[PDB]
Amino acid sequence: MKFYIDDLPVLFPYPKIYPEQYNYMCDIKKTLDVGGNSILEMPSGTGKTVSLLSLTIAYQMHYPEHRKIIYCSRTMSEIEKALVELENLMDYRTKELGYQEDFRGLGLTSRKNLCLHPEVSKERKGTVVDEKCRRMTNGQAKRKLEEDPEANVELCEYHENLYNIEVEDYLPKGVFSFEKLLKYCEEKTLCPYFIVRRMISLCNIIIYSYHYLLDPKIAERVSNEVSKDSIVIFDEAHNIDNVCIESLSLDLTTDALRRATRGANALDERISEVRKVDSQKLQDEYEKLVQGLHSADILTDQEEPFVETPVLPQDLLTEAIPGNIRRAEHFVSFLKRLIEYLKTRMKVLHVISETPKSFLQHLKQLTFIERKPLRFCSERLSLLVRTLEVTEVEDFTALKDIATFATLISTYEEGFLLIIEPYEIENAAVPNPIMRFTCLDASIAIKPVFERFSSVIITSGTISPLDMYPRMLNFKTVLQKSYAMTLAKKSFLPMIITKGSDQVAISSRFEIRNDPSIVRNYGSMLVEFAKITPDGMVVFFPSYLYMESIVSMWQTMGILDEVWKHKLILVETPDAQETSLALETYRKACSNGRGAILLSVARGKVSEGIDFDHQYGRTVLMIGIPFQYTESRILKARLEFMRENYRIRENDFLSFDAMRHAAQCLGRVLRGKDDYGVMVLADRRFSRKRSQLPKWIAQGLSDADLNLSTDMAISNTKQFLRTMAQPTDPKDQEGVSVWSYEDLIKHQNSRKDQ
């Protein structure tokens, strides 16, 4: 199609359209006209990605100003989803237009999933791979190699071929999805990571995960060339706040503290030996401190920066010397005092939580070490290590942990809160004190971007209610609109199976435990569904331990034998690799004959990015409703902050979060409108939350479908599956809900110009 938005050619890649998509285009354009934020809940039953990209590409390529687009999907999985879809859009746009492209748009993830060097990438832990690539191609090992040709220094050489040809120019012209990028850069033997990383200065539109936007420890290279004005799109933004918090929290365990002790000892050895060999350079660095923050080589570092800056991006940093810390031995002694104070405060008997200011004063009491010198510890340690040009980091992992802790707790205040839990009550009365440190205000991490960028979007197939986010994140919006699934047919059957056959209220709320009534009830539910649905089914237990116990003692009964007799079982397990393997076998079985069941965790990785299309998902479940307070009081503290700072009570917030995750789980089971699928729930408490759900889910959830028993549930879903199976394709009722090629939109809404 090529219709108009009263100025904008739109090269929508499909002959068909959807109505909701057209409204989406209209409203997002209206947003881009006037600087605002205007969160927009478009049900995932449609294609939100196609609408977003089509309109935004057309806008950027039509007006002359907003030259760059930033797209932040939650996980690299959705990164490549957006990438492949964008590539197809681009091909369509060229095909309809000839060649008017001149367009580049690149994904951006990390070394671990990009480093092509065989031996390097053979490593598993991402941090190690990062370190290996750093050493193999640093500003220093290159000098060691070139000045001293020797077997000591090797290189990916992909960095070298880049240095030869790629950093004069760019990749040919494509919007390279990771499949395409990896294939090509394998052929031409390049290092994809550095390729895209340097390329950022030229890509018309960039796609990268949230962390690269909010995690200050990697959101450093944000080069306002990237936007300065750009139009920014948050896809799948319902889990924003937790990304901020997890980007700003921090953990401590006595064992890591002892590791830091070992690292400090190794540091003493290193400084001793080097100052025996060379100290004049160390004094030169003393002078480079005394002149200023040493930005000339604490910041002008093509390859150097060792310890990231966990504080917000340099906003809350001074630039003078850290006074006495200028001496390296002084610094080591400072860290010694710090770690010992941490140990003794760690031996505290029971739970204790403090404001950072309070803890700061207490440390001052025990050892008068001031805040201002403390803040500089991170870069101090990092550049000291650079001056030490150490051969390994594993010894210093705990050191950088402590540096991060010091910087955070010395920098921010009155938004964060310490807490010292001496143990894990799930195995209480054991030695395992943890110095948990976390933020409370989600807005802190976001605030810089809403400060920087002007026109931003928020979009998800699940966001609800559309007012909690302006509250929590403390940001101004314009258009807070929700879109309704205009369907000429039912197409999915939300239910609330509150009572099993025993007509007994059920949930996971009681405990994390057994109560054979509940267990047998759920097992009956699951097995009858496994009998009835065709290939493809999911479940979403509320928490991992819950699944572990439940399935263990299901296997105790014979319940699993029956579902074995019908379909396949594919559990969800903590190691990511095996999880991916299981998931792909699930897909392979669904599209094959045998039906297959995958049971996972709502909070877990599976729900985050994985998609469940027509075949791959028919009948999700929600065994229980996901809640967190199973574990300790960090949620309690954050909720305290919530109540005092925002006019929000506990159960309100808890229910809101729970329904957020529930909707995120549920929305996965549809892709288009041709798709369909049951979406059951299961708990007594669900019945009253019917309003918390996103609108388009609520519409399909009629009143009569509440607190149904399992038996009537099976009846209804049987009738559904049969009815949907029919080829109910009048194709004239689809002129209502499809707005066919170039005309029904044109006719209908060009008349609706009223």
């Binding site: 996980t75 690299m76 499949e179 962390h211 296997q555 034998d561 007799k565 393997l581």
Partner: protein
Amino acid sequence: SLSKEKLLTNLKLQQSLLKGNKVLMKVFQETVINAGLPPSEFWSTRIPLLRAFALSTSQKVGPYNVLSTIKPVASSENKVNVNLSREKILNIFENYPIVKKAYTDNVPKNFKEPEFWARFFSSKLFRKLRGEKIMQNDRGDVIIDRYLTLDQEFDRKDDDMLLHPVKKIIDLDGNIQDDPVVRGNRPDSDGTVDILKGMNRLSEKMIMALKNEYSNQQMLQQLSLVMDNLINKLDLNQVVPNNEVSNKINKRVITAIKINAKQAKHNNVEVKSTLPIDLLESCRMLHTTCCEFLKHFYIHQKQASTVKKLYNHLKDCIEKLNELFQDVLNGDGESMSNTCTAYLKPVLNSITLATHKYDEYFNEYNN
């Protein structure tokens, strides 16, 4: 898998099919043991039967359920050889090498029928399936424990042999944490995790064992009007309606009709010498298949010598049946011989016509 020459040469398959049907083996031998047909062409007629049989044979059952089930759906019959005993155990063997190996190793001694499977219950059906027995009946001894130890690392290496570089849509590994280097929290107790890995491993092994791909006008109106009038002219004396008029005409009509009734009645919609009847039936079947092969070949075409052999044999068969009729007339007399000649008239005519047609074609080709 199935080819014309393949079924032609599948001699063991062909003899198995001979064993399949008494009628089949009978007709075949009397086409062979009677110095008749080489089996090659005999099957060349019957090929579809061979194909069908072969396919009905080599039909591997699925793995899947019964394979699994052999560990789950099989927990009761503690008696002797239970349901699908050999079938279930072979499903086990394809399903799990370890049990097959242990049973084989425990053939020369320690019978795996009763006591082997009894100890197997404990050992395996605790190892696989349900939770770690650990305590309780630790009968997993000797071969059981050894194979346990084996199977541990064995399943390990299998799982190792399973790892693909999954396409980057699903790549949860690269998805999780391998973007950043972050600091979270985590808060969501050993054992049973192994149970979950067990079910995953079983399913994936199953699926992989399946990806393995193993006058007109004027006078017309005048007469019409005349008749119309006649009708309108009162008339229509149904009394005068013929009745039959000429008694003679009536009689003649009756004659015609009784003649036709007789002729069509002749349609009465039981041989004497049952042994000679069966013998003649065998002869008919023989001559029928013989002619079958000719009327195949004489139509189709370069295997002229094969046609020549067929024709010589057919002429021999014709003379044979002539002698058969002679002997029948001699022994059974006339009435029985007449009945035999009647029973064999159609086939005899057909083969004679085939012979004449071949003679004509041979003369045409030669002259």
